[PDB]
Design a protein around this ligand. Structure first.
Ligand SMILES: Nc1ncnc2c1ncn2[C@@H]1O[C@H](COP(=O)(O)OP(=O)(O)OP(=O)(O)O)[C@@H](O)[C@H]1O
Ligand SMILES: [Ca+2]
Ligand SMILES: [Ca+2]
Length: 341
DNA sequence: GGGGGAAGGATTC
DNA sequence: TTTGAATCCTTCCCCC
């Protein structure tokens, strides 16, 4: 199998630049404002000018403004980025029928039946890159290798505006020398636990005791890392169906007062249904963030799709159940819909 | 013992 | 560490 992964560079920020080129060269920070106060919320993403100084995905807006008070701060316009994204993906479906859209700015192309060797893969890469730069003025990074994971790792090493192949020889090497925390799917919480087992490289999972690994990171991740270590990575390039849609919102102030919360909940539901757009869910879950930033949710599943009225009544019950089973005040309330027809 | 599916906390981005 | 959106993934429970 030959895999070509495409990762759009600092995507949200890059899109704002394209729609307004005068932003080029300037640090641009795309933000998601929470509303509890002035500048409340986190940064979704920033261009490289802003990242050189620490401003990156996740840092509070307030802190980003302390570092770069004159940077350009823009509100997240997901709808716009999604449309630009869809056009780019469609350009990609032209280089292969077997494409997996892993997210708004990532896609995996199984190009076996399109190229014979990496040289030809690399060259198809350049085509793809140029086509996107020309057509949309968006720079992306291409990763090419034997499977989805190493094709992603190839992109991670070459971004931004890069292109990199990782052949079978580099893979065997990476299995030995790559820091495990750089393995797609392994996050901070799993990364640290792996350090607590003497595991820093993929190869290290082959010596530990399975039941010990299984019971520390989980049977799924365990089996996952072992398969990569034995270089037998098992999971093809399939489509991908967004399986859930929701919305969480922040309230002006905390409270466990049903009538105070309802307006927010109902707003979450309306926005949620706007996105559903033709998709009929069968399950609904209500989500609440307590005053001490703890998450709590309660959902229910039906044998038929959920009309908006049912969604309306059912969410009050779920919210009430929550308020009942938890004594803390609520800070944020949201809903989530899934199991579509 | 274990398939199958809901539920809801945990973790990844 | 805030701080949103979505999936991951143990776990509980019905029941053969
Ligand atoms: N801590 C966080 N809080 C909020 N959104 C986050 C956080 N971490 C990641 N994201 C979201 O995920 C996106 C960053 O994802 P990721 O590492 O996958 O992107 P990428 O290929 O490098 O990013 P980019 O657009 O940043 O160049 C953005 C946002
Ligand atoms: Ca990207
Ligand atoms: Ca991304």
């Amino acid at each position: 199998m030959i895999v070509l992964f495409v990762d759009f560079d600092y995507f949200y920020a890059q899109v704002e630049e394209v729609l307004n080129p005068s932003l080029k060269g300037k640090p641009v920070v795309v933000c998601v404002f929470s509303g509890r106060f002035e500048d409340s919320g986190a940064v979704a993403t920033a261009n490289y000018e802003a990242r050189k100084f620490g401003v990156k995905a996740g840092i509070p807006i307030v802190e980003a403004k302390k570092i770069l008070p004159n940077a350009v701060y823009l509100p997240m316009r997901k709808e716009v980025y999604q449309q630009v994204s869809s056009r780019i993906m469609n350009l990609l479906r032209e280089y292969s029928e077997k494409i997996e859209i892993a997210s708004i700015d990532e896609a995996y192309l199984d190009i076996s039946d399109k190229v014979r060797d990496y040289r030809e893969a690399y060259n198809l890469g350049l085509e793809i890159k140029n086509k996107i730069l020309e057509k949309e003025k968006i720079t992306v990074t291409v990763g090419i290798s034997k499977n989805k994971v190493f094709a992603k790792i190839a992109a991670d090493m070459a971004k931004p505006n890069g292109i990199k192949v990782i052949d079978d020889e580099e893979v065997k090497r990476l299995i030995r020398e790559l820091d495990i925390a750089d393995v797609p799917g392994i996050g901070n919480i799993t990364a640290e636990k792996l350090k607590k087992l003497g595991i820093n490289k993929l190869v290290d999972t082959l010596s530990i005791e399975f039941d010990k690994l299984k019971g520390m990171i989980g049977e799924a991740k365990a089996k996952y890392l072992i398969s990569l270590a034995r270089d037998e990575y098992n999971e093809p390039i399939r489509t991908r169906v967004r399986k859930s849609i929701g919305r969480i919102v922040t309230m002006k102030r905390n409270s466990r007062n049903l009538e105070e919360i309802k307006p927010y909940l109902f707003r979450a539901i309306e926005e949620s249904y706007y996105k559903l757009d033709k998709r009929i869910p069968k399950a609904i879950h209500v989500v609440a963030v307590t005053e001490d930033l703890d998450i709590v949710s309660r959902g229910r599943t039906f044998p038929h799709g959920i009309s908006k009225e049912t969604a309306y009544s059912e969410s009050v019950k779920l919210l009430q159940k929550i308020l009942e089973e938890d004594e803390r005040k609520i800070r944020r309330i949201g809903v989530r819909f899934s199991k579509f027809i």
